[PDB]
Amino acid sequence: LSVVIFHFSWKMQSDVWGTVSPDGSVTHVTLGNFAQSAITINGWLRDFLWAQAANVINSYGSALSAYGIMFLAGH
Amino acid sequence: TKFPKFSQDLAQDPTTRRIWYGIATAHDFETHDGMTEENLYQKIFASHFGHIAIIFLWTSGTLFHVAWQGNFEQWIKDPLNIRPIAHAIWDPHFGEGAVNAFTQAGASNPVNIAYSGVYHWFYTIGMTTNQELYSGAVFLLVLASLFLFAGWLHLQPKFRPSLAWFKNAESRLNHHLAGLFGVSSLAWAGHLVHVAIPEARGQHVGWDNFLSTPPHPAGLMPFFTGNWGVYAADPDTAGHIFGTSEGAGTAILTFLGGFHPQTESLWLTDIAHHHLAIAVIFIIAGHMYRTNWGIGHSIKEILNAHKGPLTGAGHTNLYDTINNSLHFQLGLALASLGVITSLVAQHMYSLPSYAFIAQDHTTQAALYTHHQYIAGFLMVGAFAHGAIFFVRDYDPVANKDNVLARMLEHKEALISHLSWVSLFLGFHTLGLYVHNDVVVAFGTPEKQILIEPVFAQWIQATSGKALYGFDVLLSNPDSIASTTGAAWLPGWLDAINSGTNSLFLTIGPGDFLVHHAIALGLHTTALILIKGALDARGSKLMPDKKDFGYSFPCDGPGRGGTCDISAWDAFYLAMFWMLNTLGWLTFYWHWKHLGVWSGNVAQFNENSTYLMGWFRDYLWANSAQLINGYNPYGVNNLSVWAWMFLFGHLVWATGFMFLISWRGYWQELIETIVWAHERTPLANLVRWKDKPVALSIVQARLVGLAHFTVGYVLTYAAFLIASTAGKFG
Amino acid sequence: ANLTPCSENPAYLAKSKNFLNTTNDPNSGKIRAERYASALCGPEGYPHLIVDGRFTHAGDFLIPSILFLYIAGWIGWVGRSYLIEIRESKNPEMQEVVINVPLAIKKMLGGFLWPLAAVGEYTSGKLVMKDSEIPTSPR
Amino acid sequence: MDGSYAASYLPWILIPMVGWLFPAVTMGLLFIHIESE
Amino acid sequence: MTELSGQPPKFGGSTGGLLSKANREEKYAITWTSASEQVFEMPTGGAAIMNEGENLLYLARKEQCLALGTQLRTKFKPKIQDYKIYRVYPSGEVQYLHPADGVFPEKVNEGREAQGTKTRRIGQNPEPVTIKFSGKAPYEV
Amino acid sequence: SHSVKIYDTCIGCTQCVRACPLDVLEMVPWDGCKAAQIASSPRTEDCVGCKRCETACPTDFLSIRVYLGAETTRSMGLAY
Amino acid sequence: FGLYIHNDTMRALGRPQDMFSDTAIQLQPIFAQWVQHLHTLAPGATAPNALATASYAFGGETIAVAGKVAMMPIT
Amino acid sequence: MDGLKSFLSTAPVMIMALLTFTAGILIEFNRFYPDLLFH
Amino acid sequence: MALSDTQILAALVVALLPAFLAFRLSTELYK
């Protein structure tokens, strides 16, 4: 289930989610990383588990501050 | 069945476990059918010579590869910017990016940048061209062949050493203090003053040159008469360039104290004078123990005379305990080797004695971490052989009421106090780290508990650091120990007060908490190991553990169920702790020196006091250049360390399978695979000779321990090398 | 010491103007900013703690230290003597599983005489058992 | 992939030897040894 | 003793039964005398119909035969306590294994011999230093 | 094969014999306890080393010990 | 998993033309792509009283509500 | 209720009442006097 | 200034005899 929800989160925030623009173009959250960088274990580590964990890392002194001390708590 | 030859009980079972158990009991010579007492020692002696030849072949291979494929002649021209080369790359799987990225340090072939300290070593020794160290490689091949021939001839019955020769402790302790530790350090001080220091003065001294020129122009006669100050007449000044003759006054034994200002290393004359002053004391202390000549000491009368009221019977009947057994000697040897190996590690980063090795930061990091990971191994093995000594070679009727038996009589006090010390350090070091991490998470980092480590700063104050203002005994200039007129006052004081080197680093409030963490890991690893050694004989669960042996799986599910009851399984848990605390101190060392080398000391001084600072500014920040060793766009020279990073993660998680899952599941699975092979039609032709079973309990424990260990070591040797070679290279 | 006090540190005076309000009192950061002024700070602006044993900084370490050394000893004595007075009633197992809560409340209130009672039990010999009548493990 | 050093022809045959020819005959000799009687 | 008299019970066939060790090294065979045509669970897998009278069942290990003997002696109201477990070699010889003395091992009879009985406690065992290179065991000698 | 050694602390409670699912233990007559019988292990080549006899024994540090020695086809419990 | 190790090694050895990417040796999942084609062609042929599809994850227009993307087709 | 007094005096309910009283006086002391790194 | 091919072949030949001597040591350590 960890790999299933990882595939869900990365595919939906690379190919589905993101903001929209009035001319019809769609820019995603991770700018389409799942195409050529989801096929590597280093791609799953660098572009998903290192790049997207920065929002848990750098969120101190803010509203998302309990998630950092739940991140380290789960470890 | 011929394999194994030594064991008869493993040469008869038809299972596949006899291959594994024949592999792992090949060196335990005590459990060999048909081996007497003296054949044990003679096989040990021949195997000693085999290992001492393997280590010479390994040193000869390092020498031969620096000679052949290394840019050693191009490294001495500019050793501050160019990179050393270990060897070349010849795997046929390289594409075009992996060839265009691995042609580093100016070489058309794909090479591999050396991160061990062999180049700075061979430059400080005085080797300049590749031809002389290639000749050293050929010399070490001949020397390894010499020790191989010694190992062969000491198995013939004519040259077979008797048991009383191996029991002759006093007639080899003298030669190991004088003829091995003294005269070899004497020969090394001789090589220093003859070849190493004149090559640091520019004079090329070879084997056809040292017989003619003297190292000092005064000759040998000022040593024979006296007034040795002419050997320290004119030292090398601060304006000296290494390898040339520029401000280099010829004097072979100059005690200065402090660092060479050009190479950030110790003075080579100081190194030579130190080795002479240790060779003299070692040859003096080698004439202590009694031999054929009646003058000397016999260790029985020394040990039997050290009694006491509180001590008990003292060390009486204890020479026979050490001299008859072998695991006691191996435990003492591994303990002393482990403490001096960590001494090597702590004195090769703060007192570097190699040319331009304080600037090559990745080399210093790799050498320190390698020697600490050797020292943790040797400490665990010292205690493991202590437990083997308590299982096999301990008799309570001869060691009656002495310090060993009185050690065993209060083992429930020892390991309970170690349990107390471990819980005392652990509850509050984790308590302060979680307290700091919560109050930084709540945006209030002023509520952190930052205890000033005043004891260590006091040690720096009596060492020479006048930074903290504690005017005690060396920083106060009017002290008793300062105004002695000794040679090491002004150079060591200016070296310890220079905030550029890595000698006596500025200890901040984070180092208090991390040094308590290393005291925690040391006390808990000592807890598991001493509990394994003292309960190796027995306890309230099974007091016949001397009868079962050292390593055995369990004693069934009865009496509560004694999984991990052997002393081998206390080694098993202590191996994880040794890897854990070595990871703690090497994370701490590498982050401190990354703050020192980059000049950003404030990052380590602000962020290390809470756990997310370690998780962000060390594990997340420094590993950014590692995982980008291969992108979908391109491949740089850090790709092999990114592949080694993922490799180390895979082996570290493969050990989890053997650790968590146990044997009975895998035996039920192997029954089905055996059925499928015996009922597949075209595979009924091929049948096994040995019946395939699952791995045994203690066996697959050891396999999961091996994967945990080498997985840990490979992923950390990937990260520790590539992060500081991406930052400084 | 090489550490500047918080009354004149520039980084601490720059950081004290925006201390965050912890409790519901809106002036809690300001009163914390003047409470932590007596302490000493390093080059980062956070209050360090001198722990050497000098009494001029005993409020950093020693004044809570003996305070905990009361309360832990209180808990230890309440946990110890209660076990002694359930060494026999009829059966100690149920009296350890369910609590004889008036006896526990009696010990919990009376535990504040613990250090004089500790020296009294150490002198009477009913604190430390003998080294031979203790159920040790076989060697 | 080439060799700028002396005797570049030598790893061209020593890498497949120690990679294939040495471990195949080592495992062949060891499997013949450990399964014989 | 040397000849196995019995009929095979009604069973459809399983996969955990006799593997290639039976016709090569050894196998086992349990023979018992039933009362009715009841149902028993064999340790190979699944259920089987126990035939009326003396019936014979071939198994691969002795532990499966003793597990079936436990199932015959406890899980039936007509308690079958007259079963014989033989060991059959591929050469054809049949070795009477259990209850070969004639009476069950749970009760005592005259005619047995104390094999593997020590005359000391476990705390009176010798130490492995005095026999460090004799090749024996600390429990044997 | 393993070695099942039975010491003189046995009280003849015959729990170990009815617990072992391989018929190696058996009660022989004796004169050193109240039950006047002691367990004995003649068929030690059939013992797998399961130590199920060292779960049902009432003495302190149970009077029957199973020393795990050599292995074979019977002692490893293989049906193949 | 050995597919993941194989193109991890082909990316680490600097040869991206030997990977299992889309520009490399491509393992196109043809069955679910054909099923997505049937779900896109469903309203009007095999579900005539249905206006839109079962979802916009199979195939169709990009649904944008408040500057963000609700559901676009997942190739 | 001769059994309710025994159930309210079991080990989990008494240790939860004691930890509730301890956490209560700790939170109250930290509300009326917050942010005390030292004395 | 670098090495020559004959020095590499001489290094192989002078290391051939440690292979024979380690083979002798391994044979007499087995027996």
Ligand code: CLA
């Ligand atoms: C992060 C994981 C972790 C942690 C915290 C511990 C912690 C501990 N191990 Mg340990 N250990 C671990 C992994 C870990 N181990 C692993 C992977 C192995 C390898 C198998 C071992 C093997 C090992 C051995 C072999 C031994 C220990 C022992 C100990 C204890 C003493 C050492 C110490 O530092 O004092 C105390 C440190 C602490 C951090 C304790 C605090 C724990 C929490 C925070 C207490 C707070 C209460 C908690 C919140 C209540 C939960 C409430 C919840 C139900 C809602 C300590 C409890 C030794 C022992 O127990 O004897 C003394 C011992 O002999 N360990």
Ligand code: CLA
């Ligand atoms: C499919 C992937 C793959 C494969 C097969 C290889 C294969 C190889 N690489 Mg390689 N490499 C790879 C991917 C791969 N690489 C990647 C992705 C990178 C990152 C870009 C690299 C980077 C790299 C570098 C930088 C170097 C190599 C080198 C080598 C060669 C090792 C030389 C040798 O045979 O020593 C023998 C092999 C060993 C000693 C290792 C085996 C250790 C065993 C398992 C442990 C001992 C077992 C037992 C106790 C004793 C053996 C028993 C037996 C005798 C029966 C070998 C041909 C080196 C080279 O060219 O050679 C000089 C080299 O320098 N590789």
Ligand code: CLA
């Ligand atoms: C002068 C006479 C002499 C000499 C030189 C030796 C030498 C030796 N004996 Mg020996 N022996 C002697 C007399 C002598 N023996 C006598 C008279 C007896 C009579 C009973 C014995 C009985 C004896 C036995 C029974 C055994 C030996 C063994 C050994 C070897 C082990 C030492 C070793 O490998 O590490 C040498 C280590 C050092 C020289 C340095 C120690 C580490 C230092 C302290 C660390 C710090 C400095 C470090 C060097 C810095 C490194 C820097 C780096 C750049 C290199 C060694 C070759 C053992 C053996 O066979 O092993 C092969 C063995 O089992 N000897």
Ligand code: CLA
């Ligand atoms: C001076 C060093 C030294 C010496 C001479 C010995 C000697 C001995 N030890 Mg020992 N030991 C040491 C250090 C040493 N130890 C240390 C440092 C530790 C702690 C780690 C131990 C832990 C230890 C244990 C736990 C045991 C011994 C035992 C023994 C005895 C038998 C060894 C045997 O048969 O192993 C056979 C050899 C092996 C099993 C080889 C395993 C090691 C492999 C190479 C590790 C795999 C690494 C992997 C291939 C790397 C991959 C890299 C890459 C390919 C990815 C023997 C007297 C045993 C004993 O006396 O009781 C039976 C025993 O149980 N030792």
Ligand code: CLA
């Ligand atoms: C109140 C009873 C009591 C008392 C007087 C002690 C006393 C002691 N314990 Mg201890 N202990 C207790 C309960 C108690 N323990 C319990 C319940 C546990 C299980 C969690 C432990 C687990 C434990 C370990 C693992 C160790 C000690 C050790 C020690 C000794 C060193 C001091 C120490 O570290 O304690 C600190 C105490 C703890 C870390 C755990 C106790 C924490 C609880 C919350 C205390 C209160 C328990 C209870 C609820 C109060 C009863 C009140 C009553 C009215 C109902 C000391 C003699 C150490 C030793 O051997 O020293 C040589 C050691 O290693 N204890």
Ligand code: CLA
């Ligand atoms: C132990 C030290 C050591 C080590 C780790 C290596 C490692 C290596 N050598 Mg090498 N070498 C060594 C000593 C060593 N060498 C010595 C002493 C010589 C002089 C004869 C050479 C001569 C040599 C040549 C000429 C070449 C290599 C090459 C290589 C690389 C590919 C492997 C290969 O083909 O080797 C095969 C090596 C040989 C056939 C001869 C050396 C054999 C040594 C003497 C045996 C070492 C004993 C060892 C400790 C036993 C371990 C036992 C353990 C498993 C229990 C690899 C990096 C090749 C290379 O650079 O490719 C890029 C290459 O062309 N080596």
Ligand code: CLA
């Ligand atoms: C450590 C040594 C080593 C070495 C040198 C190699 C070398 C090679 N591997 Mg390889 N590999 C290794 C370890 C090694 N591997 C390991 C450990 C693994 C497991 C992870 C793999 C898995 C692997 C895969 C999965 C693949 C390779 C492939 C290749 C080849 C790439 C080019 C090619 O297609 O060759 C063409 C093939 C050859 C050169 C085969 C050798 C045939 C020779 C020329 C015939 C000589 C025989 C002759 C008659 C006998 C002479 C007698 C003698 C005494 C003189 C290359 C030769 C690729 C390949 O296609 O290889 C087939 C490939 O797909 N390797």
Ligand SMILES: CC1=C(/C=C/C(C)=C/C=C/C(C)=C/C=C/C=C(C)/C=C/C=C(C)/C=C/C2=C(C)CCCC2(C)C)C(C)(C)CCC1
């Ligand atoms: C179990 C066992 C064992 C083991 C053990 C061990 C392993 C131990 C270890 C131990 C150790 C590991 C120890 C160490 C320690 C040391 C020390 C503790 C030292 C100290 C020193 C000093 C104190 C000095 C001083 C000084 C200083 C500090 C500084 C300045 C200078 C001077 C010099 C003054 C054995 C083998 C016996 C066997 C039996 C059993």
Ligand SMILES: CC1=C(/C=C/C(C)=C/C=C/C(C)=C\C=C\C=C(C)\C=C\C=C(C)\C=C\C2=C(C)CCCC2(C)C)C(C)(C)CCC1
């Ligand atoms: C002041 C100070 C310090 C110091 C300290 C020290 C140095 C310590 C030591 C310590 C020690 C040296 C200790 C000893 C001890 C011993 C013993 C012997 C103990 C006793 C105990 C007991 C006996 C217990 C009992 C009890 C109680 C009391 C209560 C509760 C219950 C019980 C039972 C637990 C420092 C620097 C840190 C800092 C500053 C301050």
Ligand SMILES: CC1=C(C/C=C(\C)CCC[C@H](C)CCC[C@H](C)CCCC(C)C)C(=O)c2ccccc2C1=O
């Ligand atoms: C997987 C697993 C098995 C099954 C292991 C098996 C079937 C062994 C299969 C090993 C295969 C053949 C790989 C071995 C090859 C390795 C590369 C090692 C090389 C061989 C050495 C001699 C060098 C167990 O038996 C087991 C037992 C107890 C706890 C955990 C486990 C466990 O996790």
